[PDB]
Amino acid sequence: RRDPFDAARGADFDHVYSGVVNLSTENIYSFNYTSQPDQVTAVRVYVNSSSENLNYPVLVVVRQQKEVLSWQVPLLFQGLYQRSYNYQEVSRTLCPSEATNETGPLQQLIFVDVASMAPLGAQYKLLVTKLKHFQLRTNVAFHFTASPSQPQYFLYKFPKDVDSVIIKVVSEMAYPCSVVSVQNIMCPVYDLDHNVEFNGVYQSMTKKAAITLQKKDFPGEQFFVVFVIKPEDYACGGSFNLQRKKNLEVTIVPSIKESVYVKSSLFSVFIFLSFYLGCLLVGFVHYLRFQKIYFWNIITIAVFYALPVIQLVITYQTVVNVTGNQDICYYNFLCAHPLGVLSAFNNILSNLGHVLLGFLFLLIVLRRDILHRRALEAKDIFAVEYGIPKHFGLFYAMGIALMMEGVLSACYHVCPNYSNFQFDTSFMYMIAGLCMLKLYQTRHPDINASAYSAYASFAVVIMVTVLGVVFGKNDVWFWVIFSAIHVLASLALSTQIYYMDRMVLLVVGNLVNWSFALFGLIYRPRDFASYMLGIFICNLLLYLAFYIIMKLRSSEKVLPVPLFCIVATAVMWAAALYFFFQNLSSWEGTPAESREKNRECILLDFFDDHDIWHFLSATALFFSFLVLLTLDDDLD
Amino acid sequence: RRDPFDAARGADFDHVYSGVVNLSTENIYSFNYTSQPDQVTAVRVYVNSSSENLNYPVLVVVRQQKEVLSWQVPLLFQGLYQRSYNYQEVSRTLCPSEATNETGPLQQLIFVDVASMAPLGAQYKLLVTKLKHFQLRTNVAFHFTASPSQPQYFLYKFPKDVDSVIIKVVSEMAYPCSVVSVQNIMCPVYDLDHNVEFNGVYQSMTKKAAITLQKKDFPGEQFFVVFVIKPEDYACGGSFNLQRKKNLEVTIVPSIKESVYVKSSLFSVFIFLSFYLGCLLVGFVHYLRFQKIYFWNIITIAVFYALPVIQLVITYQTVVNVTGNQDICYYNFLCAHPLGVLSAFNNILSNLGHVLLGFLFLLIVLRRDILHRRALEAKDIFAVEYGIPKHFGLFYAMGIALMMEGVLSACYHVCPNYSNFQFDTSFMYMIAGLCMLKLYQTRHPDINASAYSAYASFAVVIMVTVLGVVFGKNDVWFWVIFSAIHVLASLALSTQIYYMDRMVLLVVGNLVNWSFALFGLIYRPRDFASYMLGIFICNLLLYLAFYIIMKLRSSEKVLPVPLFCIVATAVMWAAALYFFFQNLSSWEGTPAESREKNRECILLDFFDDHDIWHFLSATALFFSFLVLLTLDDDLD
Ligand SMILES: *[C@@H]1O[C@H](CO)[C@@H](O[C@@H]2O[C@H](CO)[C@@H](O)[C@H](O)[C@H]2NC(C)=O)[C@H](O)[C@H]1NC(C)=O
Ligand SMILES: *[C@@H]1O[C@H](CO)[C@@H](O[C@@H]2O[C@H](CO)[C@@H](O)[C@H](O)[C@H]2NC(C)=O)[C@H](O)[C@H]1NC(C)=O
Ligand SMILES: *[C@@H]1O[C@H](CO)[C@@H](O[C@@H]2O[C@H](CO)[C@@H](O)[C@H](O)[C@H]2NC(C)=O)[C@H](O)[C@H]1NC(C)=O
Ligand SMILES: *[C@@H]1O[C@H](CO)[C@@H](O[C@@H]2O[C@H](CO)[C@@H](O)[C@H](O)[C@H]2NC(C)=O)[C@H](O)[C@H]1NC(C)=O
Ligand SMILES: CC(C)CCC[C@@H](C)[C@H]1CC[C@H]2[C@@H]3CC=C4C[C@@H](O)CC[C@]4(C)[C@H]3CC[C@]12C
Ligand SMILES: CC(C)CCC[C@@H](C)[C@H]1CC[C@H]2[C@@H]3CC=C4C[C@@H](O)CC[C@]4(C)[C@H]3CC[C@]12C
Ligand SMILES: CC(C)CCC[C@@H](C)[C@H]1CC[C@H]2[C@@H]3CC=C4C[C@@H](O)CC[C@]4(C)[C@H]3CC[C@]12C
Ligand SMILES: CC(C)CCC[C@@H](C)[C@H]1CC[C@H]2[C@@H]3CC=C4C[C@@H](O)CC[C@]4(C)[C@H]3CC[C@]12C
Ligand SMILES: CC(C)CCC[C@@H](C)[C@H]1CC[C@H]2[C@@H]3CC=C4C[C@@H](O)CC[C@]4(C)[C@H]3CC[C@]12C
Ligand SMILES: CC(C)CCC[C@@H](C)[C@H]1CC[C@H]2[C@@H]3CC=C4C[C@@H](O)CC[C@]4(C)[C@H]3CC[C@]12C
Ligand SMILES: CC(C)CCC[C@@H](C)[C@H]1CC[C@H]2[C@@H]3CC=C4C[C@@H](O)CC[C@]4(C)[C@H]3CC[C@]12C
Ligand SMILES: CC(C)CCC[C@@H](C)[C@H]1CC[C@H]2[C@@H]3CC=C4C[C@@H](O)CC[C@]4(C)[C@H]3CC[C@]12C
Ligand SMILES: *[C@@H]1O[C@H](CO)[C@@H](O)[C@H](O)[C@H]1NC(C)=O
Ligand SMILES: *[C@@H]1O[C@H](CO)[C@@H](O)[C@H](O)[C@H]1NC(C)=O
Ligand SMILES: *[C@@H]1O[C@H](CO)[C@@H](O)[C@H](O)[C@H]1NC(C)=O
Ligand SMILES: *[C@@H]1O[C@H](CO)[C@@H](O)[C@H](O)[C@H]1NC(C)=O
Ligand SMILES: [Zn+2]
Ligand SMILES: [Zn+2]
């Protein structure tokens, strides 16, 4: 019978053994070592077959006390479109075993067998090395390299006090894709292409990756971090001595404490309660100085828009929480602090203003309308020859739209995805349309188009946006049709509004044509909803400026409060647009590329760009509504 | 150096070798064989270690010309909640290599090494057998068994003419879950627990599985079918000499031809064009004898309900087509014939009636209303003393609701899922509500409650159903609250309708109470939408029956046409309810259990139960609308 000790070559690590194997010859080595308590040893085996022989690959088998590994040196990879790749260098890290004080020192023996079947012979070069840079320490960086045939992984241990950690992986050249996974300390370790996704959380990456881990999940307070490169780049982007070495740096940082949550919640509440306090102060000062269809329409639309998206997001959040695959939601993982089951608590809590300011506007408008109704009940002719008709439902509709926009934004931000690209700024379309309607009605007679003209406009706009996003991704005929429709609509609106100021119509038409040429030359926004939002904002601001300049030309003085509100609205809009143009993650494109643009939070240790955008949008919209309400105070 | 031939034991298949291995001993066998053209050989290796030693398992390594396999005899499995399982028998099928005429007969050698590290010794029993039942033949069944540590797989070759095939797998006892996968002929073959989902389509199963394959996808017109059992049953259902042997039967059947598509399309078109032909003939015979809000409301609801679900189903269909994981959509895979990119063509084409019948009803109502308007223009006092007020909006609303319910059902059936349980019968809620409103208005004065009463009713009903399904799955407090609200609503409706027939209110209340007791004792419908549909249908039929009986008690003769329409409506309702009660697949429950209840098509070779349900529902609704329209013809 075969005797390993008899034919084994008592060998030592770090010596590059070389050999040649025939059909009737096999080589075996008998490495030995010892492990001591409080230390972790991880052996690594490198095998390079100098020859390129492919019909008779060299077969390598590593035997330990309780595990067996095996592979070939000329590793062969098969890729789509019938492509073949051959790698002539292979490496593997053996699963380590801990040694406790009770167990004491442990002696370990490892056998390595190299054998082939070539009739003439195949060369091989074998190296076995120990690992000193195996463990990882919190806050200390680390650099290394990986290859499609040389997967890597390391060990981390939970400190005494840390209850949550973040793993950040950074690279420079994103040519070959990669996968980063976290697993428990239970051999075997799945560090292969076809089994790395079986267990533990994982993330595909090309230039950036971030994973947040708690403590209660892992027994023993330790885990393995595995990095695996991929033969082809189809999954994470474009198309595909062969080698694809990729350099990586890995950092582990403790997570924030609950004190940050308390601070952020208190700040968010109080910053917006200050507005109510100021309104109460102003009302007190004024008192001292003195000393329909929209309802059910909005209710139905809100329920219709809420139930489906709400259930869809519930299901997506549950699935992402259960399966552990962090490639479904398009979060901004660098700053996403979870609470309870929620995965991104900040992005939802940052929507408090959209509700609070809407509530304040509703309260103020209701009080003003009730006061005007009481005054009319008392009757006064000063509001007839020196007054204009008053309407109330429009402002309530605007405020309810603001509330619904806030709730929709929160629901969408629960888990962003390509199927929820709308519901993020959808209701601001309605807000802009309502402001347009209010401006149109205030100057000209009522001539109300009931309420369904705006409904049809919104339905058509959503139709066109969805059609363009889902189909107009790469086509231009639809783009030409949309441009023609937009130009025709602009001309028709200009003609209708027209019937000293004969050049404003030409100015608006020329601005629209300039935008037409701009995106025709650029011809690649790829975000139809964003451009629709921008165009609505542009038209609203243009109409507001035209109306204000016309009022100025009419030789009347504007009350100071409308002027202050105008300036505040302008500044807030500027800031909000600045924070909006910043891009963090995007539903379009593969998840690996979406995370390629992430940032590590601004302001406090909680918020980031998008939260500031939410805040500034809420404030700017509130000030615009107040300006619209109060602009015509001097007329009475 | 090590010499394989020197220590190799020239062995033969089917002989159960036995041995004992120590630290310094390792046994090797050197099996040999030859492969001839037009035949496929697949060796299989069984290894059983009699001892239960966990600390010192036996290591087995199989070496071939181009592949190496390795494993341990006492296989260890880790399961959730810190559970461990050990299997003492292992088996494996080597990847076969085809032998072509040009290549000629091919000699093959296979080395098997058994080695351990026990200080005393470990026993082992090894068997190597050839496979004669490896290939699969079309339409011929096959029985076999599998175990968590003994995965199986077989080969299939595409016949000359078959362009599409179906693989059906059947079992009897669904205790241990299983996975069935299809892969190409390219070694290695992933038949392990942690890598079986990497490549090729796959399906989790417990009692039934079905997979449809085309021909152009596979080069060589051949493929491997792999069956893998699972250590635990958490994924596919409940909780978890150890063994879990599972018996399976596999059949392969050629798919249908395009002639079936042509036949089914022509039949579906003509069966429903027959209604228009009959209406035209009736109009011809009659001629020979003679010889606003709803619009915009429904149009807005159309987009508001279509765009989210339409885009969402687009995304699901694209993803399921791309990845190849057949566990997202809850189809009925036994009868799902795809066309182009669509995966279930029949379930969509079976919705032609919901549109055609609605269009016919709209046309007939428009013609009748226009004729009545012309007659009124001519003026006739007969329709005053012996006439009743005429209305038209409700009938148009009903027709549009039907025409939109058809499209909603089609969109939902594009890819059924737990996030789309509505949109299958939602619009018929509004249909029943409108029928009730029309019945209320026809007898009592107009007293139109505008149109938003039913709007709020529908919104509240949908909200309640969604809340119950998402949350009231295992709770009873919500169920008690819902029952109390239903009883209160029934009492209020009876009181309002009341103000010879003093017992009808008691009868309706008692029927509602009987339903209360029924679903309280059963207390497990777990389909809130289904029971909402049932209750709405029951109330509609109940009110219609009481109205008709009251009219009968009024001592007037009913025109034969309304009687015929009533009888046809009753018969169609009975048939539709019968076809509805049949259950094929269900979004609730794991996908493995959902496919556990599937059926192999009825009627032609295309349709099944659900399509017949669609047809019968459309016909019954159309006849009910016609009955409502024509019920009071005798009055004039
Ligand atoms: C086996 O490998 C060796 C390569 O070193 C070759 O065979 C050797 O041939 C020489 C010359 O006759 C002998 O002195 C050695 O004893 C042989 N060794 C062995 C292990 O066979 C050859 O490449 C291989 N064997 C054959 C038959 O080609
Ligand atoms: C197999 O090939 C690789 C690369 O072809 C060899 O790696 C070399 O390692 C030395 C050691 O410092 C470096 O100086 C060389 O630069 C490396 N090669 C290259 C191309 O950079 C490796 O030694 C070969 N053999 C084994 C067993 O790995
Ligand atoms: C090796 O296996 C054998 C069991 O078959 C044991 O060692 C044998 O011991 C007898 C008695 O001294 C010798 O005659 C044999 O030559 C030995 N065989 C071998 C392969 O060493 C024992 O179980 C194992 N070896 C040890 C050291 O325990
Ligand atoms: C390992 O154990 C299994 C079962 O424990 C053995 O399988 C037996 O095979 C014979 C051959 O027909 C059957 O008659 C027995 O019924 C099987 N066992 C049982 C429990 O049913 C097997 O022979 C053992 N060894 C190997 C190498 O498989
Ligand atoms: C009433 C309005 C203001 C609420 C707006 C925020 C809503 C959308 C938020 C607040 C609380 C959230 C829920 C809190 C907890 C969980 C449990 C988790 O396993 C699934 C998601 C689910 C069910 C969340 C879904 C989104 C949610 C309902
Ligand atoms: C405009 C909105 C976002 C403002 C915040 C209001 C709502 C959404 C907030 C207020 C209090 C919050 C809850 C506070 C505590 C918990 C318990 C935790 O285990 C799950 C999340 C859950 C249930 C939170 C979900 C979101 C929540 C309901
Ligand atoms: C950001 C992507 C979606 C493209 C859209 C950009 C939008 C937000 C930008 C681009 C051009 C901008 C406009 C340029 C000029 C003016 C005139 C000024 O008196 C009021 C603001 C207004 C009308 C701007 C509003 C914001 C605007 C419309
Ligand atoms: C004409 C009126 C409406 C302008 C008021 C809005 C202002 C604040 C907006 C309009 C265009 C915006 C800029 C558009 C593009 C860039 C380049 C980017 O790398 C930094 C931000 C920056 C510089 C933006 C900052 C905010 C910005 C200047
Ligand atoms: C106009 C009305 C009657 C149509 C109602 C059925 C709708 C939902 C059907 C008709 C055509 C269908 C499309 C036909 C082809 C494909 C390509 C596939 O890769 C994604 C789905 C997609 C895009 C289908 C989605 C569903 C679809 C849009
Ligand atoms: C349910 C009701 C509304 C459907 C009635 C409209 C019919 C005619 C529509 C609905 C879906 C459509 C199909 C959608 C997708 C494809 C795949 C394409 O490669 C050929 C055309 C084909 C096969 C379409 C033909 C027309 C079609 C069958
Ligand atoms: C099938 C699941 C969702 C449970 C609901 C079952 C429904 C559809 C069943 C159960 C009880 C049935 C009702 C029982 C009695 C009557 C009175 C009769 O004069 C007309 C039929 C009618 C009105 C039935 C209609 C169908 C019905 C409502
Ligand atoms: C005509 C109107 C009043 C409807 C009357 C109710 C009739 C049509 C319905 C109500 C309950 C139904 C039954 C409920 C359950 C089953 C068991 C199933 O394995 C076969 C069909 C069968 C036997 C159904 C046949 C149709 C049925 C009898
Ligand atoms: C190495 O020495 C012998 C040789 O195999 C081995 O039995 C022993 O366990 C090892 N001890 C150490 C300290 O490496
Ligand atoms: C083992 O002993 C060392 C001695 O310093 C101590 O630091 C360590 O915590 C001990 N470990 C265990 C598991 O007892
Ligand atoms: C079996 O016989 C020898 C023994 O190793 C082997 O070389 C040869 O290829 C095999 N031939 C056949 C016909 O099986
Ligand atoms: C090989 O020869 C046999 C002889 O009957 C023939 O049937 C078969 O088609 C041939 N196959 C190839 C690939 O030439
Ligand atoms: Zn946002
Ligand atoms: Zn259906």
> How far is the C-alpha of B573 from the C-alpha of B583, rounded, in Å?
18
Out of A6, A109, A418, closest to residue B315 by CB: A418
SS3 sequence of A218-265: CCCCEEEEEEEECCCCCCCCCCCCCCCCEEEEEEEEECCCHHHHHHHH
- Distance of alpha carbon B412 from the chain centroid: 12
Beta pairing class for B246-254 and B164-170: antiparallel
In angstroms, the Cα distances linking A97 to A39, A106, A159, A334, B75 are: 10, 9, 20, 33, 19
Structure tokens at B239: 């909780």
> How far is the C-alpha of B284 from the C-alpha of B294, rounded, in Å?
32
CATH number for domain B133-255, candidates 3.90.1200.10, 2.60.120.380, 1.10.3470.10, 3.40.50.720: 2.60.120.380
> How far is the C-alpha of A585 from the C-alpha of A583, rounded, in Å?
6
A629 phi and psi angles, rounded to 5 deg: -65, -45
> What is the b/e burial string over A313-342, where b = at least 16 CB atoms within 10 angstroms of the residue's CB?
bbebbeebeeeeebbebbbbbbbbbeeeeb
The answer to whether residues B536 and B435 touch, using CB atoms and an 8 Å cutoff, is no
Measured from the Cβ of residue B72, the count of other Cβ atoms closer than 10 Å reads: 18
In angstroms, the Cα distances linking B73 to B49, B54, B122 are: 6, 10, 11
> How far is the C-alpha of B192 from the C-alpha of B179, rounded, in Å?
10
Beta pairing class for B246-254 and B143-146: antiparallel
Structure tokens at B147: 């175990």
- Distance of alpha carbon A463 from the chain centroid: 25
The secondary structure of B143-182 as a DSSP string is: EEEEBTTB-EEEEEE--SS--EEEEEEE-S--SS-EEEEE
The answer to whether residues B622 and B364 touch, using CB atoms and an 8 Å cutoff, is no
> How far is the C-alpha of B69 from the C-alpha of B91, rounded, in Å?
12
- The residue of chain B nearest to residue A309, with distances taken between CA atoms, is B308
- Distance of alpha carbon A219 from the chain centroid: 30
Chain A residues 310-349 with a CB less than 8 Å from chain B? 311-312, 314-315
B59 phi and psi angles, rounded to 5 deg: -110, 130
Burial zone of A120 (CB within 10 Å; 0-12 exposed, 13-18 middle, 19+ buried): exposed
Q: Does the beta carbon of B467 lie under 8 angstroms from any beta carbon of chain A?
A: no
Measured from the Cβ of residue A33, the count of other Cβ atoms closer than 10 Å reads: 14
Ligand nearest to the CA of B27: 3
> How far is the C-alpha of A458 from the C-alpha of A147, rounded, in Å?
52
Q: Is the dihedral of CA B586, B589, B592, B597 positive or negative?
A: negative
Looking at residue B334, the DSSP 8-state letter turns out to be: G
The answer to whether residues A294 and A393 touch, using CB atoms and an 8 Å cutoff, is yes
The overall longest dimension of chain B from CA atoms, in Å, is 119
- The residue of chain B nearest to residue A456, with distances taken between CA atoms, is B300
The answer to whether residues B222 and B155 touch, using CB atoms and an 8 Å cutoff, is yes
Pocket of ligand 12 (CB under 6 A): B 570, 573-574, 577-578, 581
Alpha helices in B444-590 (DSSP H): 452-471, 477-498, 504-522, 528-553, 560-581
B567 phi and psi angles, rounded to 5 deg: -65, -45
Single out the residue of B96, B63, B283 nearest to residue B189, CA to CA: B96
Whether a cis peptide bond, with omega within 30° of 0, leads into A188 is yes
Structure tokens at B59: 């290591």
> How far is the C-alpha of A510 from the C-alpha of B627, rounded, in Å?
60
CB B102 near ligand 16, within 6 Å: no
> How far is the C-alpha of A241 from the C-alpha of A87, rounded, in Å?
8
| Reported resolution, Å | 3.2
> How far is the C-alpha of B165 from the C-alpha of B213, rounded, in Å?
5
Residue labelled with tokens 């039934």 = B208
Burial zone of A474 (CB within 10 Å; 0-12 exposed, 13-18 middle, 19+ buried): exposed
SS3 sequence of A296-321: HHHHHHHHHHHHHHHHHHHHHHHHHH
In B38-105, where do the E strands start and end?
44-48, 59-63, 68-72, 75-79, 83-87, 89-93
> How far is the C-alpha of B230 from the C-alpha of B489, rounded, in Å?
51
The answer to whether residues A508 and A490 touch, using CB atoms and an 8 Å cutoff, is yes
Looking at residue A412, the DSSP 8-state letter turns out to be: H
CB B100 near ligand 16, within 6 Å: yes
Contact B66 A78 (CB under 8 A): no
In A135-207, where do the E strands start and end?
135-136, 143-146, 152-157, 164-170, 178-183, 202-205
The answer to whether residues B595 and B208 touch, using CB atoms and an 8 Å cutoff, is yes
Pocket of ligand 1 (CB under 6 A): A 20, 22, 24-25, 121; B 1
- Count of positions (residues) in chain B: 636
> How far is the C-alpha of B515 from the C-alpha of B535, rounded, in Å?
9
Indicate the fold that domain A1-132 takes in CATH. Answer: Jelly Rolls (2.60.120)
Among B269, B272, B318, B342, which residue has the most ligand 10 atoms within 8 Å of its CB, making it the best to mutate? B342
Structure tokens at B100: 């072509």
Looking at residue B192, the DSSP 8-state letter turns out to be: S
- Count of positions (residues) in chain A: 636
Structure tokens at A201: 């959380």
The secondary structure of B101-122 as a DSSP string is: TTT--EEEEEEEEEE---SS-E
Residue labelled with tokens 């409060």 = A561
Radius of gyration of chain A (CA): 33
Single out the residue of A129, A142, A152, A156 nearest to residue A40, CA to CA: A156
The secondary structure of A118-144 as a DSSP string is: -SS-EEEEEEEE--SS-EE-TT---EE
Q: How far is the centre of ligand 12, averaged over its atoms, from the C-alpha of B577 (Å)?
A: 6
> How far is the C-alpha of A359 from the C-alpha of A612, rounded, in Å?
20
Cβ-based neighbours of B190, under 8 Å, separated by 6 or more = A194, B181, B183, B196, B198, B199, B226
> How far is the C-alpha of A32 from the C-alpha of A128, rounded, in Å?
11
> How far is the C-alpha of B250 from the C-alpha of B225, rounded, in Å?
10
Alpha helices in A116-251 (DSSP H): none
The overall longest dimension of chain A from CA atoms, in Å, is 119
**Helix, strand, coil shares of chain B as percentages rounded to 5?**
45, 20, 35
Per CATH, B1-132 and B133-255 having the same topology is answered: yes
> How far is the C-alpha of B63 from the C-alpha of A70, rounded, in Å?
10
Q: How many CB pairs under 8 A join A and B?
A: 158
Single out the residue of B190, B177, B400 nearest to residue B298, CA to CA: B400
Out of A5, A299, A418, closest to residue B459 by CB: A299
Contact B68 A70 (CB under 8 A): yes
Bridge partners (DSSP) of residue A208 are A170
Which atom of ligand 6 lies nearest, measured to the CA of A410?
3
CB B541 near ligand 11, within 6 Å: yes
Bridge partners (DSSP) of residue A32 are A109
Q: Does the beta carbon of A467 lie under 8 angstroms from any beta carbon of chain B?
A: no
Contact A300 B455 (CB under 8 A): yes
A467 phi and psi angles, rounded to 5 deg: -60, -45
The answer to whether residues B80 and B234 touch, using CB atoms and an 8 Å cutoff, is yes
Measured from the Cβ of residue B344, the count of other Cβ atoms closer than 10 Å reads: 22
Domain ranges of chain B: 1-132, 133-255, 258-473+526-630, 474-525
Chain B residues 182-201 with a CB less than 8 Å from chain A? 186, 190, 192-195, 197-199
